[PDB]
Amino acid sequence: FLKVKNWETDVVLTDTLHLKSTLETGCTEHICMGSIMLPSVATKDQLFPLAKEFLDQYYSSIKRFGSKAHMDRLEEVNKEIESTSTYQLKDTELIYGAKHAWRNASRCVGRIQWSKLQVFDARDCTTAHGMFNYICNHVKYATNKGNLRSAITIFPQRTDGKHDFRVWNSQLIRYAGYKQPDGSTLGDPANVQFTEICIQQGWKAPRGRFDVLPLLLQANGNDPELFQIPPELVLEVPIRHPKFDWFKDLGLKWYGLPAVSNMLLEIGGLEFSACPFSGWYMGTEIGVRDYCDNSRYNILEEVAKKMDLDMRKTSSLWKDQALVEINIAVLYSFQSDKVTIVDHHSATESFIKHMENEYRCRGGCPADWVWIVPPMSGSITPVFHQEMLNYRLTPSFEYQPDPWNTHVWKG
Amino acid sequence: FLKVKNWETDVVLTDTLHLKSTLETGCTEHICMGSIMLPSVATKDQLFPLAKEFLDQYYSSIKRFGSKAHMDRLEEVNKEIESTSTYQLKDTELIYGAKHAWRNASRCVGRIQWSKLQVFDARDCTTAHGMFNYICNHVKYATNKGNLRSAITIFPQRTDGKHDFRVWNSQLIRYAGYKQPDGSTLGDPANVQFTEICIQQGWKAPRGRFDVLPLLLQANGNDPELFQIPPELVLEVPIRHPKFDWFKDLGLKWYGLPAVSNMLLEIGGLEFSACPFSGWYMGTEIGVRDYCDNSRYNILEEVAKKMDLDMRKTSSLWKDQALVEINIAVLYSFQSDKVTIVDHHSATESFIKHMENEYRCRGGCPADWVWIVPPMSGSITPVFHQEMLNYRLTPSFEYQPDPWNTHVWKG
Ligand code: HEM
Ligand code: HEM
Ligand SMILES: N=C(Nc1ccc(CCNCc2cccc(NC(=N)c3ccon3)c2)cc1)c1ccon1
Ligand SMILES: N=C(Nc1ccc(CCNCc2cccc(NC(=N)c3ccon3)c2)cc1)c1ccon1
Ligand SMILES: C[C@H](O)[C@H](O)[C@H]1CNc2nc(N)[nH]c(=O)c2N1
Ligand SMILES: C[C@H](O)[C@H](O)[C@H]1CNc2nc(N)[nH]c(=O)c2N1
Ligand SMILES: OC[C@@H](O)[C@H](O)[C@@H](O)CO
Ligand SMILES: OC[C@@H](O)[C@H](O)[C@@H](O)CO
Ligand SMILES: [Zn+2]
Numbered sequence: 001f002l003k004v005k006n007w008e009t010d011v012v013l014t015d016t017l018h019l020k021s022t023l024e025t026g027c028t029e030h031i032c033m034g035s036i037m038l039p040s041v042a043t044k045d046q047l048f049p050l051a052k053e054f055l056d057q058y059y060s061s062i063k064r065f066g067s068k069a070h071m072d073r074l075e076e077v078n079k080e081i082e083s084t085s086t087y088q089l090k091d092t093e094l095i096y097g098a099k100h101a102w103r104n105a106s107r108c109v110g111r112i113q114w115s116k117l118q119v120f121d122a123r124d125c126t127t128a129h130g131m132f133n134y135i136c137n138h139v140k141y142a143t144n145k146g147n148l149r150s151a152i153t154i155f156p157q158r159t160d161g162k163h164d165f166r167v168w169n170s171q172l173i174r175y176a177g178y179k180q181p182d183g184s185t186l187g188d189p190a191n192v193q194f195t196e197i198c199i200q201q202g203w204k205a206p207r208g209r210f211d212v213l214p215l216l217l218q219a220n221g222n223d224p225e226l227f228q229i230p231p232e233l234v235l236e237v238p239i240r241h242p243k244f245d246w247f248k249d250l251g252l253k254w255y256g257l258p259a260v261s262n263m264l265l266e267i268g269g270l271e272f273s274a275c276p277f278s279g280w281y282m283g284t285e286i287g288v289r290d291y292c293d294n295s296r297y298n299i300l301e302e303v304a305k306k307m308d309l310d311m312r313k314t315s316s317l318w319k320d321q322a323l324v325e326i327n328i329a330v331l332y333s334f335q336s337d338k339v340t341i342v343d344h345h346s347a348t349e350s351f352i353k354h355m356e357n358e359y360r361c362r363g364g365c366p367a368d369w370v371w372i373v374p375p376m377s378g379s380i381t382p383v384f385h386q387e388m389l390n391y392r393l394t395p396s397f398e399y400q401p402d403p404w405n406t407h408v409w410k411g
Numbered sequence: 412f413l414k415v416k417n418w419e420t421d422v423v424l425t426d427t428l429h430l431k432s433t434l435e436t437g438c439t440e441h442i443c444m445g446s447i448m449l450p451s452v453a454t455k456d457q458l459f460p461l462a463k464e465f466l467d468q469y470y471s472s473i474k475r476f477g478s479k480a481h482m483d484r485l486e487e488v489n490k491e492i493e494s495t496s497t498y499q500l501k502d503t504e505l506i507y508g509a510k511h512a513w514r515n516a517s518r519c520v521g522r523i524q525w526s527k528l529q530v531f532d533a534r535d536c537t538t539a540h541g542m543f544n545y546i547c548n549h550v551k552y553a554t555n556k557g558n559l560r561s562a563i564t565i566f567p568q569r570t571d572g573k574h575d576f577r578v579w580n581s582q583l584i585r586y587a588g589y590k591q592p593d594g595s596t597l598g599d600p601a602n603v604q605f606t607e608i609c610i611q612q613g614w615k616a617p618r619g620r621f622d623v624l625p626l627l628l629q630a631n632g633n634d635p636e637l638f639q640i641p642p643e644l645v646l647e648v649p650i651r652h653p654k655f656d657w658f659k660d661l662g663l664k665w666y667g668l669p670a671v672s673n674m675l676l677e678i679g680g681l682e683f684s685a686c687p688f689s690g691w692y693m694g695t696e697i698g699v700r701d702y703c704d705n706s707r708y709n710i711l712e713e714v715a716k717k718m719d720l721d722m723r724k725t726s727s728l729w730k731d732q733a734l735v736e737i738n739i740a741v742l743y744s745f746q747s748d749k750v751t752i753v754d755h756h757s758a759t760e761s762f763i764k765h766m767e768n769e770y771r772c773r774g775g776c777p778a779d780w781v782w783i784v785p786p787m788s789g790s791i792t793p794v795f796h797q798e799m800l801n802y803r804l805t806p807s808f809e810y811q812p813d814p815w816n817t818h819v820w821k822g
Binding site (some may be wrong): 022031295321327331384392 | 413415416418419429432433434435436437438439440441442443444445446447448694699700703704705706711725726727728730731732734735738739742746754756757779780781784785786787788789790791795798799800801802803
């Protein structure tokens, strides 16, 4: 029964939810790995406890734990795992598991919204063209003309392992990255391997900066196929500043819709390798990381130039000064276009408010401080001063290798 | 043999030093506590392994592991722990243990300087007046007319537990905190309990803001006594800005010398409860935390006012904008007065450079990411992108309770 403190408010919360945790963190009693970025087919013996555990808390959730329908559903799944050595979720079980994977995502500061999620059951899908159709419907729905709405699209579960639905893009909407003859990089350096895989598969690149990539969709373990998202469905925010008119001349823009596609959704021991989920941006992921990581767009040089800043010295904080201006601009631009975005102050406050709820009506909230704390102005946000217990609860979103590293090709 | 990655540079380092770790982190395989702020008399049975371990690595250090002088010193300490159930360090062992406590301080970003430390052996001290004399000599030396130099002053080790040397101040130089009739707080809210303990012991407060506190010095477990550091030894930097002339009218100032006094130094199983250590400031501890924590001086309201900023909305980032300006001012002011200070960019770079050294010539470097990452502009500093293994090596600096919570008074 562990205790977490907030040192800005002296609020104390007691955590008993971590007791239900099952999987391992990477840490031991004699070494903490809380800052390691990635922490490291299934038999039917392994599958029933996972279905049992999941189904016990799903029925416990709708205030019908143990009754007739529960014992029947345990027997039902038990029988089906005998018959097929897998099983199939109810539409309701699928929506519970999804929402709860997000709920348990300990690196996610947006989780106050975990219950307002739209689940698109795509488990009838059989082809890359069918995948393309489902994804476009996702983008159109979630985008909602800038009034963004959270959603996930769930393609068929892994079965054997050699018939896996995968979206090879990291995000449904990502800008291309091309290297140059002079070793420099145009576009997003993050995506240069994937941009060239698409070119390898016959993409015809417009070789500029903010080039929306095509989807590469793998269906039933087959070789993946290229599909360009119709551009009318790709909402983009051009970035201007509410003071600096030269900021328009910078010619920056980002897409409205963050939609992660390269993650694995685990529900009752069943693995969905294709499960793109979308919400909206916290401002910092664009202005700080995307725009200012040295290995990303890396624009601190140019914004500081136009700001007329002392760039000779490290200690002028010219990087810091241009970093605040850049994030003022992303927020201002997104908001003037009525496109949903949250600032790192409002986002982190809501997450403390969420934390109170989870500790009250659930007895805890797994949280990864290293990822929860925004990448600028850390300690003026309330989560800096908030102790967080990290533990792994299921249903969950897991990392998975890139398909081109694992795919036996044959074509 | 664990591996840590840097994701900005793709540099990889292998850690075998953590194997020598002994004490526990608070984390288990199923729960990470890397963001909990505090992680929770000794018999002669317990003391020899600790002396043995320490002495084995000290002789291993001067390239004389196992030789005659080593076996004699093990026998010597062994015999003395039989005779007294404690023992005494050589002047050289005391300097090694001190430097290495700092070296192993995993929350310290300044550790590239760990070998350049001045050890003042105060183990002959017997009185609060003697403590006062040693501390003033520390301040004068370490301050060095603004060309700051690192030092530690080590008072006699804990023996029984009821005769403890303690400095009741958190830092040798701290500004006073007074509450008001209207519940507000003048000075440093952090120190309000300690400011009133001093007033309780007859301090005569000048009840303003930046009131240097008196020392409260406990000697050989006796009741502590008040001594005002001669003000000529208290170097102070008035804070101005290199653009905003109204910044002078803000009337801010900080002391040059950070000198922690409330920590416990552990060497070969021997506990020094009074061991004030001093270095110099990273700019952010003043501009970000001291000046802008909500529960500290909390000046973001006033700087943003004078900056003429949109304070209506959270999403204007007016807090962020005034936070960069404030830290530009602290650095600029300290540097114009030739008083040593480091900026959070230079400090964090040096710590990566230090990390390379420790992994090369020592096989590892314990590091606490939660504390290493500066509290503003986190991800534009190179330590944001650097994985860090945290583990507890000894010699070490440990937290300890406040004396007024533990002191059996009798006066
Ligand atoms: C609703 C608005 C949302 C906001 C403001 C938000 C915010 C964030 C942010 C800032 C991060 C850190 C990402 C990074 O720095 O790489 C993150 C991570 C994450 N989010 Fe949320 N998110 C939202 C919606 C969602 C949804 C709908 C899901 C799942 C259905 C989700 C699941 C996750 C997961 C699993 C991570 C961890 C990813 C990783 O470990 O790389 N989020 N979120
Ligand atoms: C030489 C210049 C130094 C710099 C720039 C520096 C920097 C820092 C900073 C910024 C912190 C975080 C403090 C906080 O946020 O509360 C810290 C913590 C710490 N420093 Fe260093 N420091 C220096 C010297 C020293 C010395 C001389 C020692 C010991 C002999 C030391 C031992 C520690 C310890 C033990 C902590 C952890 C304190 C805690 O857990 O509360 N440092 N340092
Ligand atoms: N893995 C490498 N880099 C790498 C790759 C990925 C990451 C994590 C990035 N997740 C992106 C992400 C996840 C979750 C939420 C958001 N944002 C939202 N707001 C949102 C999006 C959808 O809903 N809400 C963004 C971090 C580093 C690597 C390996 C070798 O080199 N680089
Ligand atoms: N413990 C509480 N607060 C609290 C108390 C202390 C801390 C840690 C503060 N260490 C101060 C510190 C330690 C080490 C280095 C520096 N700086 C230097 N540059 C330097 C100083 C000397 O050499 N180098 C500063 C954090 C929070 C509490 C309990 C109840 O309420 N509050
Ligand atoms: C080394 C470190 O673990 C790595 O930089 C992490 C730190 N915290 C992060 N936090 C978020 N939200 N996103 C990230 O990519 C990272 N990267
Ligand atoms: C809750 C959290 O552990 C707490 O705010 C920590 C975070 N990191 C820190 N880092 C430093 N350097 N100093 C601090 O006081 C803290 N406080
Ligand atoms: O929204 C996530 C952003 O794309 C970045 O933070 C990535 O983590 C890589 O920099
Ligand atoms: O130098 C340390 C500063 O005094 C603060 O960071 C304290 O941690 C409390 O805010
Ligand atoms: Zn841990």
